[PDB]
Design an enzyme around this catalytic site. Structure first.
Site, PDB file in Angstrom:
ATOM      1  N   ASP A 648       2.104 -14.082  -5.782  1.00  0.00           N
ATOM      2  CA  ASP A 648       2.131 -14.887  -6.996  1.00  0.00           C
ATOM      3  C   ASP A 648       1.186 -14.336  -8.064  1.00  0.00           C
ATOM      4  OD1 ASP A 648       3.823 -16.635  -5.573  1.00  0.00           O
ATOM      5  OD2 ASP A 648       2.908 -18.379  -6.547  1.00  0.00           O
ATOM      6  N   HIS A 687     -18.306   2.602   3.250  1.00  0.00           N
ATOM      7  CA  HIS A 687     -19.562   2.055   3.748  1.00  0.00           C
ATOM      8  C   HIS A 687     -20.224   2.960   4.773  1.00  0.00           C
ATOM      9  CE1 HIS A 687     -17.766  -1.893   2.279  1.00  0.00           C
ATOM     10  NE2 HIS A 687     -18.884  -1.747   1.592  1.00  0.00           N
TER      11      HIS A 687
HETATM   12 ZN   LIG Z   1       4.179 -19.220  -4.993  1.00  0.00          ZN
END
Ligand SMILES: [Zn+2]
Ligand code: MET
Ligand SMILES: [Zn+2]
Length: 746
Positions: A648, A687
């Site tokens: 999203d 790291h």
């Molecule tokens: Zn969604």
């Protein structure tokens, strides 16, 4: 009466940090460290005492971590350290905390939803527990001698277990909570010495109770305290809770625990718990009201607090209502007094740990009828000036109200088609190469413009000759901090001079303060990015920090919802992106290093957070051209329970952490999800100071291609290179490219 759940241990000027670091380096002895440690505790205790505090905590102090402390108290040290019994000392302790020249340290993880990290206990059926650390009883007696009677603080036995993890080789069937019979006896011995020493109150921190616990687990608390009741006899017992409200069921378990006479509630972050209190509180038990926020930097609202405390008084109050903090002051700064740059007005709106002890006490006196009219008046005035100051509120409210215009997806154009237009502008090959941002910082000093240019051209000239690297970065030589760099150029920000907070071990962080409406007055990155994108014909990417990360790593204002603030940040970044676009930067990277840091403890509150978090990110570039490629970087390697949120976000390309993870796990993207956008899983651990080889890197890329489509897979490191040295990055990067170029031919 007044109470404080815990206190910072680094000192007003981080005395402990330097003492520990001096000791670790061998430039000071064990005694020297202890001298600094004891003076610090004496100072803290007398400070709280002189303030009028009745329940002063002991054992809040720690050389590294509170959980590690209880691990030493239970003698539960891992096999690899070769401990053989007896009172545990600095050696074994720091060895667990940071490891040594021949043994790795224990894992450290995030403490609830704070920015603090604890050391995770490694438990299993083979560990032979034992009372191996008298830190608590010692501190109690030490404080006793100093003349200040304290309340010993222990991490509750069942919270301790739920916060642990099974050691390697321990069957998955094993259940940590099965160890209660082995650790409870030790808690008994510790409580027995505490009573013998004179302690009349003891504090058990059971913060896990604020989590979503199944019925079976809550039952574990019940049995534990029932088994502890006879030992808790003739002793007031406070079970502490914080960071969120207490679930209805959890509240029943808690208010009916054997031997417990007092209950601590976070009423800043778990105000919801009030409903249950009003519904029904135990007969004659104490209620510790944590009304003073020990998680932020703002001055308390005395009026409001009093109103709340008085209502609770009605429910009990007959000398059973104690004023407390919302949580340990460990999660806030030490003393406002040491802030000598911030103007008096902004300071009047603030309050650090030292000031919060005064606040709890002012509230306690006010409830007792001895209200200091001079304190409440100064507070009322401060709250007023803040609530009416133009520095706080701005026409940003105009722009703010508009985002309600539904979501903010980039102009429809599915990412797949959008990727096509970008490829038109960026004639990139299969498996393109690029880095995450920063490069090893050379000499550097404290005009300057020219000094910074030289360092960039050197990184650009390096990037080019250096395996070519298909997409370049400028190295960020002009930035000292991801967040501060941008905060110093934003509206509602203010920066502290000595407000450090413990992050873990000896490392502290000084979070920026967002006091008012944020807006970007001028361009911030366009100058440097435009300059970098001119020294090369290769694509130069822009560098910005997401609004979520800026929000999470800042002491955010408590006068409006977080998301409301996050959008103001998004709006301001929205400009810079579009300014970088008009500037010519066709590739803009937005890293949300801390996207997951603001996740609520309440599971059902997750979705809501992830929603505005991601929205904020989209808002950042919803108005960019389809040819403009946008990258988002995220310091994580586990997205299985947040994958849909990454989607999203709708980035053209996302780069995550990977190189210590099983490539096969990347199927989380191509399964019941069908990502269909750019993805660049790390192939070089930044790291570690060791140089991976073209053989290994190339190998990881193939195993990776086994799952991901070669047409959306990028080749880049795990994160920035700031902490690395050019002697480690140069050959490392060259191997990464050879691996790609090779895989390309195949
Ligand atoms: Zn969604
Ligand atoms: C910690 S996220 C990465 C931030 C920045 N782009 C860097 O490369 O260091
Ligand atoms: Zn990172």
């Amino acid at each position: 009466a007044s109470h404080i759940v815990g206190y910072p241990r680094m000192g007003p000027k981080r005395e402990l940090k330097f003492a520990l670091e001096s000791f670790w380096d061998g430039k000071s002895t064990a005694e020297d460290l202890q001298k600094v440690s004891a003076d610090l505790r004496s100072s803290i205790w007398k400070q709280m005492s002189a303030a009028g505090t009745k329940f002063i905590p002991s054992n809040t102090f720690a050389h590294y971590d509170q959980v590690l402390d209880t691990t030493a108290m239970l003698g539960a040290v891992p096999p690899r350290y070769g401990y053989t019994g007896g009172e545990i000392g600095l050696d074994v302790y720091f060895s667990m905390a940071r490891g040594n020249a021949s043994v790795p340290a224990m894992e450290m993880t995030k403490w609830f939803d704070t920015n603090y990290h604890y050391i995770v206990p490694e438990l299993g059926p083979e560990v032979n527990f034992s009372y191996a650390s008298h830190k608590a009883v010692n501190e109690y007696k030490e404080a006793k001698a100093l003349g200040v009677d304290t309340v010993p603080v222990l991490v509750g036995p069942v919270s301790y277990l739920l916060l642990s993890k099974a050691a390697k080789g321990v069957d998955k069937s094993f259940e940590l909570l099965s160890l209660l019979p082995k650790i409870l006896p030790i808690y008994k011995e510790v409580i027995t010495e505490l009573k013998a020493a004179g302690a009349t109150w003891i504090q058990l921190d059971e913060p896990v109770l604020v989590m979503d616990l199944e019925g079976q687990k809550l039952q574990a608390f019940t049995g534990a305290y029932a088994e502890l009741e006879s030992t808790l006899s003739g002793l007031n017992v406070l079970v502490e809770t914080y960071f969120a409200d207490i679930p209805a069921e959890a509240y029943k378990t808690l208010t009916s625990l054997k031997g417990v006479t007092a209950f601590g509630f976070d009423l800043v972050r778990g105000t919801k718990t009030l409903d249950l209190v009003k519904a029904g509180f135990p007969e004659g038990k104490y209620l510790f009201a944590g009304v003073v926020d020990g998680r932020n930097i703002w001055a308390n609202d005395f009026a409001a607090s009093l109103s709340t405390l008085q209502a609770l008084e009605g429910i009990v109050g007959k000398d059973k209502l104690v004023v407390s903090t919302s949580c340990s002051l460990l999660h806030t700064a030490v003393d406002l007094i040491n802030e000598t740059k911030l103007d008096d007005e902004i300071k009047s709106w603030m309050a650090f740990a030292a000031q919060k002890v005064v606040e709890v006490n002012a509230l306690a006196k006010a409830l007792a009828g001895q209200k200091d009219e001079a304190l409440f008046s100064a507070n009322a005035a401060a709250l007023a000036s803040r609530r009416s100051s133009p520095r706080v509120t701005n026409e940003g409210v105009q722009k703010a109200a508009a985002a309600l215009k539904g979501s903010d997806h980039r102009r429809a154009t599915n990412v797949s088609a959008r990727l096509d237009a970008q490829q038109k502008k960026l004639n990139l090959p299969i498996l393109p190469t690029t880095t995450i941002g920063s490069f090893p910082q050379t000499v550097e000093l404290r005009e300057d413009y020219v000094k910074a240019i030289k360092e960039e051209i050197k990184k650009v000239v390096d990037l080019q000759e250096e395996l070519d690297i298909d997409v370049l970065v400028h190295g960020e030589p002009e930035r000292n901090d991801m967040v501060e760099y941008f905060g110093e150029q934003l509206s509602g920000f203010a920066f502290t001079a000595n407000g450090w907070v413990q992050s873990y071990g000896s490392r502290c962080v000084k979070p920026p303060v967002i006091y008012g409406d944020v807006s970007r007055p001028k361009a911030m990155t366009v100058f440097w990015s435009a300059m970098a994108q001119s020294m090369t014909s290769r694509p130069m990417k822009g560098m910005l920090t997401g609004p979520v990360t800026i929000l999470n790593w800042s002491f955010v204002r408590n006068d409006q919802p977080r998301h409301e603030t996050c959008y103001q940040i998004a709006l301001a970044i929205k400009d810079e992106v579009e300014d970088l676009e008009k500037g010519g930067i066709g590739v803009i990277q937005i890293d949300e290093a801390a996207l997951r840091e603001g996740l609520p403890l309440r599971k059902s509150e997750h979705a809501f957070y992830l929603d505005w978090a991601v929205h904020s990110f989209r808002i950042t570039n919803c108005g960019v051209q389809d040819s403009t490629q946008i990258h988002t970087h995220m310091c994580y390697s586990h997205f299985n329970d947040i994958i849909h949120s990454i989607i999203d976000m709708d980035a053209d390309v996302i780069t995550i952490e990977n190189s210590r993870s099983d490539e096969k796990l990347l199927s989380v993207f191509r399964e019941g999800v069908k990502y269909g956008a750019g993805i660049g899983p790390g192939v070089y651990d930044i790291h570690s100071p060791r140089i991976p080889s073209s053989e290994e890197i190339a190998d990881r890329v193939n195993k990776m291609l086994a799952v991901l489509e070669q047409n959306i897979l990028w080749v880049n490191p795990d994160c920035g290179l700031k902490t690395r040295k050019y002697t480690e990055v140069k050959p490392a990067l060259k191997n990464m490219v050879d691996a790609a170029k090779l895989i390309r031919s195949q």
